[PDB]
């Protein structure tokens, strides 16, 4: 009873990892204390010393905890002990051990999927922003060319109206050629930006889609992991590593 006791340091914190508010268990230098009530409260473990006939008037380790399962801890010092924490009930030893290999291959496949997708996600994050920067650079490039076809018109159409007879079409045609190149280049540039933006959306769509499936994988990755740990908890009540 005191040895079995249901609930009775690093691996304590791992057993506490991701349980809700209230959850607990009891631990064991002997020249320090005797036992230790570890109690999880809102994502932070809270360690309480047990000093040992009296464990003051409570005559056992099992005595003092049953009292505080019903009740809060506030009256001793300024939350309860609410959570004192399947396997296909396989009384098999060997066949619980192959499930441990198989859930591990499921888990370890599943982790690859989650690990792959995080790269895809993050490369995609980068590649997107690279595009966004490129779009700004395009837009800036465009502005200097817009500014150019402006710039020419002023100094171009001063040298249309001064003189006119001198040069005439031997002047203005070869000035008008230069200008025709200038704007149909801008034409290409603007199309080059558009064509980038469409790709951004298709990228950003896939960006959303990666995350969408990441998030779906996650919750089952935890339960696959959680069942695996309870399976390997049931066995242990050096043989393991080949399955795993």
């Amino acid at each position: 009873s005191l040895q079995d006791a249901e609930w009775y340091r690093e691996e304590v914190n791992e057993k506490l990892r991701d349980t809700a508010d209230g959850t607990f268990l009891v631990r064991d230098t002997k020249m320090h204390g005797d036992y230790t009530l570890t109690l999880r409260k809102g994502g932070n473990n809270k360690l309480i010393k047990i000093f040992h006939g009296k464990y003051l008037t409570f005559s056992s380790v099992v005595e003092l905890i049953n009292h505080y399962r019903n009740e809060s801890l506030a009256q001793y010092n300024p939350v309860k002990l609410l959570y004192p924490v399947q396997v296909v009930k396989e009384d098999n030893i060997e066949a619980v051990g192959k499930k441990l290999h198989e859930y591990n291959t499921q888990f370890q496949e599943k982790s690859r999927e989650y690990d792959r997708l995080y790269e895809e996600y993050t490369r995609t994050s980068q590649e997107i922003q690279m595009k966004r920067t490129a779009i700004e650079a395009f837009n800036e490039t465009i502005k200097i060319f817009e500014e150019q076809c402006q710039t020419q018109e002023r100094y171009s159409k001063e040298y249309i109206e001064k003189f006119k007879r001198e040069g005439n079409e031997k002047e203005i045609q070869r000035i008008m050629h230069n200008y025709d190149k200038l704007k149909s280049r801008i034409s290409e540039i603007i199309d080059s930006r558009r064509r980038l933006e469409e790709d951004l959306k298709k990228q950003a769509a896939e960006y959303r889609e990666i995350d969408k499936r990441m998030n779906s994988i996650k919750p089952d990755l935890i339960q696959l992991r959680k069942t695996r740990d309870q399976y390997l908890m049931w066995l242990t009540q050096k043989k393991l590593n080949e399955w795993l």
Binding site: G33, G43, I48, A134, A137, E140, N215, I222, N241
Partner: protein, 1051 residues
């Protein structure tokens, strides 16, 4: 019958990275193309609006391009509407997306980072040309400085203007007793912190005497001359400088008295160089204290210094010339406010979830301080998934006055139990102002090995990435801008709470934190406090022990070292308590830096605490010990609440005072500039450093320019030129390296691994791509020192685009520390913490160690022609073949000394399993590991109490340890070795606090192997800190015994 004829229907071999090289990508010389074509067309926009398109060579200078553009524009219209070419400067949009004026017209068309191949011509606007060499700073930083000038945030702008306080103060210290003080900045003495010599070093010294060699140069220069002295180890450079000049200028024409007079005139015109690199001996230290000397003594080497004229030194050091940049109401005390905290959530917008898979989603919240000051709460599971919105006010059971200064709201969107996104806000701003109003917070995704719901340790502030879950919200507004109290005010409330406690009465039920003992505490108490004091940082403290500490908080001032423990015992939700702590910490005894760095990790977020910790460093931490731990101090910056703080002002100043620190401070910040959790912070910091470091900027710019070329080079090799023969690749490599732009950019600069070594003129004959699939480059350079010949004529280091160096970087740093711990305690295990440096996202540099081979090479060379089985002895045979005579015995000592240390370091750190292709042996017999992999046992996240032995000593090693015996496990040679391992294992165990703390400080970086404190907890089990040291040894013996199956059970 193999597969029970089961078909996998989906599997297709039509291209299914399993079938190296994981990061990428990073565009190069032009938008979307790594290397611009060798001849290319460039559209030259003119002042007259004409577009002449020149064909130019890739490698052509803007001087060349302009010079030809103003020829070829004559043949176009409107030529008389252009000024002389000299009245113009080129300009274009870059890949950073910024219009950059091109002043340095010596630059080549490839090296401009150009986006579109085009160039507008203008007359140089903004006549102040020199200050538009922020280009230099923005190149060094790798983001343009104008990207800051257009940031709104006041803090950012406040940081830039106020941090100049620190710059100006540093530059003052530099030109104080110039030129010497300048020379001291640039070429600081490279010295151990201790002048005391370890007993094993002294014994090599012929009762405290070294043979040295001073070299000199006369006329024309060429001829040099040795002057081999035999001086006392603990004499200074000035004394040594004299003894050389004496012997140089003794003569048959000079009386003894005439020498004395010719020495005095000559003596102080000279300083000691090291032959072959830019180390100097610029101040009064025992020669033995300089690092170069102490290495020469350990290696059986005779120091080779050079007498260098102070004026030929102060010739090279140019002026720093620092210039200031162009960037040159009453309130309501928090304690007035009488309400509990409540925070209004509003609408998440961009939440990407399968409504099939996921039921319903909510927002978890909580207030934090590292750990939390109240019950964590959520909101209800509303408008689940399909456009999520909750308009709730969450109510937190803490009064607004009991918020601690350093408090921060943590939040996260969750599923039904599973986290989607996260983000944390500081509850006060950088101006002490309690946050009130509406806030827009864009969120961060949960990382790899993060299962938890909320992420307190993660970075404060919003994501700057727009297209992410933008969860907006609102803060309670108390008609006035609410501020945190003055110190004067908190002192008063402390002294009140003090005297209030003196009149409290007799019994208290849960007196617990009330003493009742008075000024007289019991002797068993004062013993249980030093018992606690000693416990490491990860032995979590019980609520009894916390209140026990918190009661005797005043006797805790007798045991300064208790402070880290004490602080985690304060209740930060009781301003009564917190105010009192602020007064102990005000005048707490400063402590050793090794203990005080604990206080700049995530679990000590308070400003006053962190101040105390910096005050510690300011006093005790030497420039030596700073650069030992600079990685950790730069990492720790991420946990600071605001841009402007004391830790940043300390490090920025050290950086600007000592250029060896500066050098690495640049590179570690610049290393992390890709990572947007820090790009702003570090960018701002790097701007400041760069603006004030003077001429080193220009040096850094060459290093940067060199690394950029190498990154591009390997980016091309790892795409397109994959699936080509090494043969074909190597043609491409050398072809490329020959082009002038590479020759310029790769030839004359300083090693980033150690800017002491210069790099000049790469020998392309010895440059090559190694065999690995990550395509690492093996680069070689002439040592251009005058005395190359005396140190190394060839300098060579490996550049590896593709692998995240920063795990390596840290383990090697840890090894380096274990060595110094061991050695400076007098016990000579010889580890070889080879140089490593990360300079980017999985980009870095690894120091080559000449004359060393992987055990596998040994065995492939020594193994017989008829490929049958490799011999255990070949290692030993290969080793004997090198070391013959009295030399042989000494090589085994070294192998056995190194092998002993690496055995222990490896085991404790839990580094990746060791085998023939990652262990190395040098011609002189020293053993050392490489390619460490995942440190604190990171394959353990699969299954894992594996308390592994990674260095498992096969026969091979054992033979060699016991000269050449049979059944080696039983020699006294091996008894010796075992005792090295036992006295090593313990010596580290005594400094376990440090190692924990060093690992604690690195949790900042997004290393997967260091996500949170139980990662670090592996190092507890393996050092066995919960046990007694007698047990620990037995644990280690046991642990070592089972990996080898016999050997380890006597004492």
């Amino acid at each position: 019958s193999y597969y029970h004829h089961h078909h996998h229907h989906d599997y297709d071999i039509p291209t299914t990275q399993g079938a190296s090289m994981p990061p990428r990508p990073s565009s190069g010389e032009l938008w979307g193309i790594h290397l611009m074509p060798p001849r290319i067309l460039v559209e030259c926009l003119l002042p007259n609006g004409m577009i002449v398109t020149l064909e130019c060579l890739r490698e052509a200078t803007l001087i060349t391009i302009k010079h030809e553009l103003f020829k070829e524009a004559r043949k176009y219209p409107l030529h008389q509407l252009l000024q002389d070419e000299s009245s113009y400067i080129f300009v274009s949009v870059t890949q950073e997306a910024e219009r950059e004026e091109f002043f340095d017209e010596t630059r080549r068309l490839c090296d401009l980072r150009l986006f579109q191949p085009f160039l507008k011509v203008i007359e140089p606007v903004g006549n102040r040309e020199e200050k538009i060499l922020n280009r230099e700073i923005g190149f060094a930083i790798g983001m343009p400085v104008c990207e800051f000038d257009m940031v709104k945030d006041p803090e950012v702008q406040d940081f830039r203007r106020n941090i100049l306080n620190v710059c100006k103060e540093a530059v003052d210290l530099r030109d104080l007793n110039s030129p010497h003080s300048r020379a001291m900045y640039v070429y600081p003495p490279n010295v151990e912190s201790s002048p005391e010599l370890p007993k094993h070093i002294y014994n090599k010294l012929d009762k405290g005497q070294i043979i040295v060699v001073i070299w000199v140069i006369v006329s024309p220069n060429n001829d040099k001359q040795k002057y081999t002295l035999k001086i006392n180890h603990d004499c200074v450079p000035e004394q040594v400088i004299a003894e050389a000049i004496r012997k140089k200028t003794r003569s048959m024409l000079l009386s003894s008295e005439q020498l004395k007079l010719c020495v005095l005139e000559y003596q102080g015109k000279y300083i000691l160089k090291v032959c072959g690199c830019d180390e100097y001996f610029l101040e009064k230290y025992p020669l033995s204290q300089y690092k170069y000397i102490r290495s020469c003594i350990m290696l059986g080497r005779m120091p080779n210094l050079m007498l260098m004229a102070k004026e030929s030194l102060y010739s090279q050091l140019p002026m720093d010339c620092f210039t200031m940049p162009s960037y040159s109401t009453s309130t309501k005390s928090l304690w007035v406010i009488n309400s509990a905290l409540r925070i209004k959530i509003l609408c998440a917008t961009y939440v990407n979830v399968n409504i099939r898979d996921i039921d319903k989603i909510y927002v978890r919240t909580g207030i934090y301080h590292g750990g939390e000051p109240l019950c964590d709460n959520v909101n209800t599971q509303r408008v689940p998934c399909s456009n999520p919105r909750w308009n709730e006010w969450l109510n937190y059971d803490i009064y607004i006055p009991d918020l601690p200064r350093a408090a921060r709201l943590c939040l996260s969107i969750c599923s039904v139990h599973c986290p989607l996104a996260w983000g944390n806000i500081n509850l006060f701003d950088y101006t002490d102002t309690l946050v009130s109003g509406k806030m827009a917070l864009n969120l961060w995704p949960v990382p790899h090995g993060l299962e938890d719901l909320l992420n307190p340790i993660g970075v404060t502030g919003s994501n700057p990435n727009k297209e992410t879950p933008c969860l907006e919200l609102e803060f309670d507004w108390f008609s006035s801008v609410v501020k945190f109290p003055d110190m004067s005010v908190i002192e008063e409330h402390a002294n009140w709470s003090v005297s209030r406690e003196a009149g409290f009465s007799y019994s208290h039920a849960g007196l617990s934190n009330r003493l009742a003992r008075d000024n007289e505490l019991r002797e068993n108490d004062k013993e249980q406090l030093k018992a606690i004091s000693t416990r490491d940082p990860l032995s979590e403290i019980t609520e009894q022990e916390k209140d026990f500490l918190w009661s005797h908080r005043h006797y805790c001032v007798t045991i300064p070292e208790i402070l880290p423990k004490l602080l985690l015992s304060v209740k930060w939700n009781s301003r009564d308590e917190v105010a009192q702590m602020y007064c102990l910490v005000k005048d707490w005894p400063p402590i050793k830096p090794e203990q005080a760095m604990e206080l700049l990790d995530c679990n000590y977020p308070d400003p006053m605490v962190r101040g105390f910790a910096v005050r510690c460093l300011e006093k005790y931490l030497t420039d030596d010990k700073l650069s030992q731990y600079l990685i950790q101090l730069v990492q720790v910056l991420k946990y600071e609440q605001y841009l402007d703080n004391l830790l940043v002002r300390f490090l920025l100043k050290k950086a600007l005072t000592n250029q060896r620190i500066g050098h690495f401070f640049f590179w570690h910040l610049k290393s992390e500039m890709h990572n947007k959790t820090v790009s702003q912070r570090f960018g701002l910091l790097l701007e400041s450093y760069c603006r004030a470091c003077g001429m080193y900027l220009k040096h850094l710019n060459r290093q940067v320019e060199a690394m950029e070329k190498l990154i591009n080079l390997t980016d091309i090799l790892k795409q397109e030129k994959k699936d080509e023969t090494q043969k074909v690749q190597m043609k491409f490599l050398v072809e490329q390296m020959r082009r002038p732009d590479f020759m310029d950019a790769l030839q004359g600069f300083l090693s980033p691994l150690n800017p002491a070594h210069q790099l000049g003129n790469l020998r392309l004959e010895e440059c090559r791509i190694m065999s690995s699939a990550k395509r690492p480059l093996w680069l070689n350079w002439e040592n251009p020192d005058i005395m190359s010949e005396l140190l190394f004529q060839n300098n060579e280091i490996i550049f590896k685009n593709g692998d995240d160096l920063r795990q390596d970087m840290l383990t090697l740093q840890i090894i380096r520390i274990m060595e110094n711990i061991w050695q400076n305690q007098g016990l000579d295990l010889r580890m070889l913490p080879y140089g490593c440096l990360s300079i980017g996202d999985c980009v870095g540099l690894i120091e080559v160690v000449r004359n060393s081979h992987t055990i596998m090479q040994i065995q492939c060379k020594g193994g017989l022609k008829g490929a049958l089985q490799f011999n255990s002895h070949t290692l030993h045979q290969w080793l004997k073949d090198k070391n013959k005579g009295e030399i042989y015995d000494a090589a085994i000592d070294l192998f056995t000394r190194s092998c002993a240390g690496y055995c222990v370091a490896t085991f404790i750190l839990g580094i990746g399993d060791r085998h023939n292709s990652n262990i190395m042996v040098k011609d002189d017999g020293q053993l050392f590991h490489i390619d460490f992999g995942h440190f604190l046992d990171h394959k353990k996240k699969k299954f894992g109490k594996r308390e592994r032995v990674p260095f498992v000593l096969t026969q091979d090693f054992l033979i060699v340890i016991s000269k050449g015996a049979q059944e080696c496990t039983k020699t006294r040679e091996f008894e010796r070795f075992q005792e090295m391992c036992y006295k090593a294992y313990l010596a580290i165990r005594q400094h376990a606090n440090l190692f924990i703390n060093l690992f604690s400080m690195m949790l900042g970086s997004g290393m997967p192997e260091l996500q949170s404190f139980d990662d670090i907890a592996y190092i507890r089990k393996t050092l066995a800190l919960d046990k007694t040291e007698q047990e620990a040894l037995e644990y280690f013996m046991k642990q070592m015994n089972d990996a080898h199956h016999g050997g380890w059970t006597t004492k």
